[PDB]
Amino acid sequence: KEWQENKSWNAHFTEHKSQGVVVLWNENKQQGFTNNLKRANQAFLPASTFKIPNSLIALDLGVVKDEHQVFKWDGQTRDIATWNRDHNLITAMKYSVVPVYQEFARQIGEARMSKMLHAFDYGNEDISGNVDSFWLDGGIRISATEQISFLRKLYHNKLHVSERSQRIVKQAMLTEANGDYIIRAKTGYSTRIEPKIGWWVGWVELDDNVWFFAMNMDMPTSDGLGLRQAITKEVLKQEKIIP
Amino acid sequence: EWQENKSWNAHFTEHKSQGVVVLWNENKQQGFTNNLKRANQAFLPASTFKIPNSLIALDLGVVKDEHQVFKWDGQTRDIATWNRDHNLITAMKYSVVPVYQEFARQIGEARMSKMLHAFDYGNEDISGNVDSFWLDGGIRISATEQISFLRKLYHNKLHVSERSQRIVKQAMLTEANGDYIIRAKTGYSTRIEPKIGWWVGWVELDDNVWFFAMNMDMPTSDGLGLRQAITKEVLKQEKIIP
Numbered sequence A: 001k002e003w004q005e006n007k008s009w010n011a012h013f014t015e016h017k018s019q020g021v022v023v024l025w026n027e028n029k030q031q032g033f034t035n036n037l038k039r040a041n042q043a044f045l046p047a048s049t050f051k052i053p054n055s056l057i058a059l060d061l062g063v064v065k066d067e068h069q070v071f072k073w074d075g076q077t078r079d080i081a082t083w084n085r086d087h088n089l090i091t092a093m094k095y096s097v098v099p100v101y102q103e104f105a106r107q108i109g110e111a112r113m114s115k116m117l118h119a120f121d122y123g124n125e126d127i128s129g130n131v132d133s134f135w136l137d138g139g140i141r142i143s144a145t146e147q148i149s150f151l152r153k154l155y156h157n158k159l160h161v162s163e164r165s166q167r168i169v170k171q172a173m174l175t176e177a178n179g180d181y182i183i184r185a186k187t188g189y190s191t192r193i194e195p196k197i198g199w200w201v202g203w204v205e206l207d208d209n210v211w212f213f214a215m216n217m218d219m220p221t222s223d224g225l226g227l228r229q230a231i232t233k234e235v236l237k238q239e240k241i242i243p
Numbered sequence B: 001e002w003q004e005n006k007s008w009n010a011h012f013t014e015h016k017s018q019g020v021v022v023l024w025n026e027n028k029q030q031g032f033t034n035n036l037k038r039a040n041q042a043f044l045p046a047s048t049f050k051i052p053n054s055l056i057a058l059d060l061g062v063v064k065d066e067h068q069v070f071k072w073d074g075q076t077r078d079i080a081t082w083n084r085d086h087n088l089i090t091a092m093k094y095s096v097v098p099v100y101q102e103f104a105r106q107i108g109e110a111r112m113s114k115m116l117h118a119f120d121y122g123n124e125d126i127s128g129n130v131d132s133f134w135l136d137g138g139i140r141i142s143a144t145e146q147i148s149f150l151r152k153l154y155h156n157k158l159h160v161s162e163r164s165q166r167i168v169k170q171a172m173l174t175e176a177n178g179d180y181i182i183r184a185k186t187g188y189s190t191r192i193e194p195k196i197g198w199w200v201g202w203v204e205l206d207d208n209v210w211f212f213a214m215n216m217d218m219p220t221s222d223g224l225g226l227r228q229a230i231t232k233e234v235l236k237q238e239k240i241i242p
């Protein structure tokens, strides 16, 4: 079977009074696994997971020259302390620094942004709303399975931007690495529009396979943000993908 | 299990449109689509919701049978065929919204919600009152979820009576000749972008059934005949119909 539903994962959500979906894709076997086929295909605002396409576009157009170029803090004090400082592409993705990315989006502009998202086959391809906030409160919507589709293209250097742009963004996605696995991923937290959700999308590299993943979960308060990674890792552990 | 056939894209291109056709071969348990991503994107069902609405109305006795007359309220609407009395068959044929809104009000939010959950029909998070949610964007469903729903209806597997299912399948009858029968329902969603047309149903042959669900961009009503015409071009290419 190409898609298997595994309701046993639901226990990882219920143990925290949570609801959500984990989608896994076994690249070598070309098979998918999820606790909820319907929610796997439900499309939501990408929030900070949009930094993946945003970064690729910015690099390919030369808005970002490389991963060292520094984006000076604009001096406005924001509620997230790590945003109140200078950043490069690596640290901007690590601390999800929206204001840096909003500047990239303004410099890309609506025509190039729209064209590029069409070329990437990204979600519903709709950038309606403010050019610099549409991924937080505009028309764009992507599901977990569509996040996987997009990430598999990035993994294989098959998106319609240069190989270099793809390699730099994969470098910026680096989240965790040890002797057992590498995780390249990006978190999101959508709060402007209901329903409020957390995301974690990315992949696990093993010695001889890659497992892509995309999860989202209801997120009524920020109390639960750690569960985005913790529930995903419980699933990976259950499936014997990681120790 | 699923096969992407981009050659069908040419049937949309001939017409300067974009869309998706999903087919399912019941005997072989295999699916075909020109567009896997669009096949799984959820769109407002519009008039295709009359299929579940009918099943629920019959099953709860809101509709006694397919002969019961629902009188016109005397208010002239934009669609001429709505300005007259209807029964279930004609209300389905002419997609008579005001008749189906009254069914929904009599079903009521609680029963509608529970029954659509039981059918596994549409998004988990439905919003909007019972007479409007299915017009205004409070529910959405993909082409592949339409197929799964219609497969259960075909086999009398939904959690309503066999009688309710047989009556709705009768009301869905669209075309029959010596080569095939088509049971289906059209949709035209205009209140939220992208405006789309649907056609969902199945083709009965002597020894197999092919389920189908298509939707396609519909920026004006001029293209509405393409819902059936494009589907049938795909059926004809696939040797399902002569």
Ligand SMILES: *C(=O)[C@@H]([C@@H]1N=C(C(=O)O)[C@@H](S[C@@H]2CN[C@H](C(=O)N(C)C)C2)[C@@H]1C)[C@@H](C)O
Pocket: A046, A047, A048, A049, A080, A081, A082, A083, A094, A095, A096, A098, A136, A187, A188, A189, A190, A225
């Ligand atoms: C992206 O979806 C949104 C951002 N993502 C966040 C999140 O995951 O909480 C925050 S920023 C993040 C909070 N902790 C990090 C930090 O500073 N340290 C770990 C030291 C940064 C934000 C809501 C974005 C659209 O706002």
Ligand SMILES: *C(=O)[C@@H]([C@@H]1N=C(C(=O)O)[C@@H](S[C@@H]2CN[C@H](C(=O)N(C)C)C2)[C@@H]1C)[C@@H](C)O
Pocket: B045, B046, B047, B048, B079, B080, B081, B082, B093, B094, B095, B097, B135, B186, B187, B188, B189, B224
């Ligand atoms: C359903 O999606 C919506 C209805 N569907 C329509 C359609 O397919 O055009 C119209 S009613 C339809 C128009 N032509 C038929 C007719 O009167 N004759 C064939 C003579 C009836 C409508 C937008 C519904 C949600 O409104």
Ligand SMILES: [Cl-]
Pocket: A170, A171, A174
């Ligand atoms: Cl790296």
